[PDB]
Amino acid sequence: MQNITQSWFVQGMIKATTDAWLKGWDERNGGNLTLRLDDADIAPYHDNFHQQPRYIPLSQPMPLLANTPFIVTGSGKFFRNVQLDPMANLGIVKVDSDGAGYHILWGLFNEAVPTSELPAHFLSHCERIKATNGKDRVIMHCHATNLIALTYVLENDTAVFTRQLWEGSTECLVVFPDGVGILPWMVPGTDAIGQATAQEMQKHSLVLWPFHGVFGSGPTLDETFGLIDTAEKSAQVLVKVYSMGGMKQTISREELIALGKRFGVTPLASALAL
Amino acid sequence: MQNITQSWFVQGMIKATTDAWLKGWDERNGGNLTLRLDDADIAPYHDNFHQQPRYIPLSQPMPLLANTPFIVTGSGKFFRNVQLDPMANLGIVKVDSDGAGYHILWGLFNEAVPTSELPAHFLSHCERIKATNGKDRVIMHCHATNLIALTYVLENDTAVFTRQLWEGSTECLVVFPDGVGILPWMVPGTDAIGQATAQEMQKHSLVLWPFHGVFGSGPTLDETFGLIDTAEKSAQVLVKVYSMGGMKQTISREELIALGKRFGVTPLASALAL
Amino acid sequence: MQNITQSWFVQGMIKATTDAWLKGWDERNGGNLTLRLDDADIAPYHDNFHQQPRYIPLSQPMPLLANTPFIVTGSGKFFRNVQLDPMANLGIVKVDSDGAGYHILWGLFNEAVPTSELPAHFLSHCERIKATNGKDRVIMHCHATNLIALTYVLENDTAVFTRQLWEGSTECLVVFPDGVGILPWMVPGTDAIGQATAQEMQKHSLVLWPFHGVFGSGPTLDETFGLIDTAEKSAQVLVKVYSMGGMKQTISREELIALGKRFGVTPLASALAL
Amino acid sequence: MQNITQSWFVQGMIKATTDAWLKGWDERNGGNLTLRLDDADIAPYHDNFHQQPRYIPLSQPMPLLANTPFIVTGSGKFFRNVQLDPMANLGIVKVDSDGAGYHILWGLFNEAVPTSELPAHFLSHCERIKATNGKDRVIMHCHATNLIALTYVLENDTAVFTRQLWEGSTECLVVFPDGVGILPWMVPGTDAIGQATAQEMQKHSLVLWPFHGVFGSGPTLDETFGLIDTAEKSAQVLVKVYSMGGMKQTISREELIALGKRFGVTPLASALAL
Ligand SMILES: [Zn+2]
Ligand SMILES: [Zn+2]
Ligand SMILES: [Zn+2]
Ligand SMILES: [Zn+2]
Ligand SMILES: [Zn+2]
Ligand SMILES: [Zn+2]
Ligand SMILES: [Zn+2]
Ligand SMILES: [Zn+2]
Question: Catalytic residues (chains A, B, C, D)?
Fold first, then answer.
């Protein structure tokens, strides 16, 4: 065999965590990533699996996720180190036959566990599966610097914040026509913040945690990463524009409207004011 | 043989896309690149060509481009991934004997197609060929962060924007004496925005799409890339200067004039106000 | 044997210095790093040791550090070059049997010596050992750009500066609940500045040298590095926020309080004003 | 033999140009570098030398430089590409027996020539040799972004600009106690701008070309590079500070004075106002 570390999904996680670390998004253990897998993905690797897979209960039943494997970043683990030791810093987990817990099948060496934002991840997986008829496979959280910065400065109103990000790069509307949901600041790594994130994931493929980070959902690691990067690129242009005293001109409502029409996209109504 | 992936032009595209990705210019699939090739370039590689080359019609006849091969980035494809799988993310295309379409000869695996900005590219190739007696070979579009930022802030007037970029780095005038044309915001990935870009490519080797990006034209990938990088470096100094409250001193008209005279360059008149 | 250069600690120092160089933190010889080792670490390597180990006296007796080996960056040496020649740029030192000096056992080729901030390092090691019952092993100093910038702008008051950094990224409080101590500007590379740093290391795992850099203490190179990076990431968001005219909203006192309670952390009282 | 490309000086030039390219300092062909060599350096490589060495006259006699070899960047050549093809992008030159010209002994393939700032380089070499009793070996010019930005904003007065850079990082004074000279803007790539640069090189190891770049002089490539990086790091902190509305506190005159006394350095008097 090839080792599981050489598999597309372990390699994908290395690539996405490293690229996010490279962006400045993932200081310390900041940020986390989980990718839903199929059985067919992990089964060719059954023989490189854990001494005996450890079971951890879920914070709450998740019957939709019954029998679902994921690969996931570990709690306390640094994005930077994933390329260096993926088996220490990643784990392959598989939720049990009625969504009450999971076995850690591979990785997370030395009694590591899945990310402390696992409630946010798994609950958002659940909603993204229903909301996209199962197409989304990734939930990604990173501390995207400019977006975080903007949360101290822009009205934390889903529609104004969406609209600013649409303006700040032409493509943004096309990439995220549903906009970006904003939560109130919440204590992170809780069931409550994961429920609230999962609820906005019903409506947006991006959700901001003010003064903390962003959560995105996508069909693949690249597309999820690129969703975020697009939101963050815009934030970065906006940071510069605001720091230079603000917009003198920008993309108008009609232009954003002609744009979503050409791209066959339905833009968040409430963000279409002026 | 060596594989085509080892050829100077596939390697050049890997180098230029990767370097642009590295700059922060090419979030997601943002940005695109096409390079005009000669027959002599691709012919030594005829035997590594496509199962059967797929034909796609052009949006409009382009008789100047009859029988011309290009290597081009694919629609939806990420600059970041080109180094990883050039054949998935690039394609070698060759316009047919009367400029009505092209066959995809190599790459663009899995039914990918050339960039959705192909009208902008090919039309601008057409004008750059006439305008430079065939010396330019590259059209490059990227989301150059500081230049985009400046479009929210500087008067979107070709001559004032040119002049600011000349000021923001001494060399700029020498590198782009013809200045940078500015389009009105337009819906991208359209025939109309490609015509309008191609029209300004008559007069400038750089063209700004406000709130979106820049288009440059050059004789080689490095020179085209470096054209852009020079415009963007200046924008970057200007962003900092404006963010610090503005210029207290700058390069004067006479100095810009003595400069274009020493370098044997004829600077855009309308940008020579004060 | 494997060479000592292949050992976890020489490799760790290469990794941490290089990563800091990569961050922009360590222009020229700026910044320095020392890591406390056990005998068991260096002993398997006794046979690759120095021609004859050179003795340098300590600036003052340090009996707690009797018989303790460290690996340390060299005076005048660049973080950038460590990956290139670790034995030229690092040294393994071992304090003597009553804390009056050390022998340079390995590295520091060509009569190099340990960092000129060695008083700061060793004295802070001494206090961090007592303050953490011997868990901290690292002292790291770098010129962390945004934190330095903030020292010209924020009230240099431990509690206001701590509080701003807590606000500037949610996790900060959890990572450094003890806050960051601020020294008056002091002449660096002196016994006085090392005593003063060591004294604040009694109370904080981070200490700012205004208009110069930060000192952090940690159990491991990654954790020490990540402590710093977290403080600096926040500073970086704050720089952007202030540059955009300041905070419109931020994390409130109660939220910071609910946060330190969920994470089982006791946040610096004096920073809990409003 | 080993090839000359593997020699310490070709490797040093690759390392310094690449690192500067990496910093953002050397867009396009911007920036240039020349390193004075000894005969003993190049002689072990005599047998890998040019088809027949081409002679180019000097713009003016330089008898001090008679029989002196240098390795130098080529005109129009990109710092980025040096690591890729050093022999295309670098050249080894040797001034003739009475300082009237040089033979290109190696590199600069395809009729490339030494940098168009060669008057600045060679004249500054001449002054740095006299001013340091022959210790300096490097002249380095790059478009250091923040320093360039500051030239639009700070009074272009040697003593105020020096003083700001001293403030903006503690170490700066120690690294460049002689300060940084400022020229009036001049047309670059001229004898006049090289004379004027060479004249300030009498007094400073750093010289600013406003709205263009910086020139530094050093004993080695690392030390010259690090001189610049230190000046630029400070500029970068200052850019942030000014962009946040300015300094509330900074390093005082007495502190800068105690600093230059501890480090055995004699700080530029005129920069010691307040
Ligand atoms: Zn987080
Ligand atoms: Zn975590
Ligand atoms: Zn675009
Ligand atoms: Zn595209
Ligand atoms: Zn320091
Ligand atoms: Zn040092
Ligand atoms: Zn220059
Ligand atoms: Zn040049």
Answer: 117
Strand order through the sheet with A138-142: A54-57, A101-107, A90-95, A69-73, A32-36, A138-142, A213-218, A206-209, A180-182
Q: Which residue has the tokens 């340390």?
A: C72
What is the spatial distance between Cα D272 and Cα D252, in angstroms, rounded to a whole number? 9
- C61, C65, C71, C77: CA torsion to nearest 10: -20
Asked if residue C107 lies in contact with residue C180, where contact means CB atoms within 8 angstroms, the answer is no
Q: What secondary structure letter does DSSP report for C44?
A: G
Give the C-alpha separation, C109 to A186, whole Å: 53
User: How many helices (H) and strands (E) are present in chain B, helices listed first?
Assistant: 10, 9
Dmax over Cα atoms in chain A, in whole Å? 62
Report how this structure was experimentally obtained: X-ray
SS3 B70: strand
Count the alpha carbons within 13 Å of B251 in the hemisphere toward its beta carbon: 31
Of C242, C21, C233, C209, which Cα lies nearest the Cα of D169? C209
- φ, ψ of residue A227 in degrees (nearest 5): -50, -60
Of D78, D152, D210, the CB nearest to B241: D152
Residue A22: closest C-alpha in chain B: B22
DSSP C183: P
Name the H helices within B31-117: 39-42, 86-89
CA-based torsion, B194, B195, B197, B201: positive or negative: positive
Note whether D229 contacts C: Cβ–Cβ < 8 A: yes
Instruction: Find out whether C233 and A145 touch, Cβ atoms under 8 Å.
Output: yes
Helices (H), chain A: 8-23, 39-42, 86-89, 118-131, 145-150, 158-167, 172-175, 191-201, 221-243, 253-262
CA angle A152–A154–A159, rounded 5-degree value: 135
C-alpha triplet D265, D271, D273: angle, nearest 5°: 115
**Which string of DSSP letters, residue by residue, matches D143-172?**
--HHHHHHTTTS---HHHHHHHHHHTSTTH
DSSP C114: B
Angle at A103 between CA A98 and CA A106, to 5 degrees: 145
The whole-angstrom separation of Cα B90 and Cα C173 is 47
Distance A153 CA to ligand 8 centre (A): 43
Dihedral, CA atoms, B221, B226, B231, B233, nearest 10 degrees?
140
**Interface probe, candidates C225, C233, C252, C263, chain A, greatest A C-beta count within 10 A:** C233
Classified as helix, coil or strand, B142 is strand
Q: Which residues of B are catalytic?
A: 117
Pairing of strands C213-218, D138-142: unpaired
Helix (H, G, I), strand (E, B) or coil at A56: strand
Instruction: Find tokens 């605001």 and name the residue.
Output: A242
Going by C-alpha positions, the residue among D64, D72, D141 that lies closest to residue D98 is: D64
Q: Which residues, at least 6 apart from D6, have a Cβ–Cβ distance to it below 8 Å?
A: none
| Nearest C-alpha neighbor of B124 from the set B40, B39, B184, B181 | B181
- The token duo for D155 is 């009074």
Query: In this structure, what DSSP letter does residue B72 have?
Result: E
> What is the separation, in whole angstroms, between the first and last Cα of chain D?
59
For chain A, count helices (H), then strands (E). 10, 9
Residue with tokens 């059209």: B139
Q: Does A202 touch chain B (CB under 8 A)?
A: no
Tokens 């980025």 belong to residue? D80
Please name each of the domains of chain B with its CATH number: 1-274 (3.40.225.10)
CB contact at 8 A, B17 and B26: yes
Chain B residues whose CB is inside 8 A of the A166 CB are none
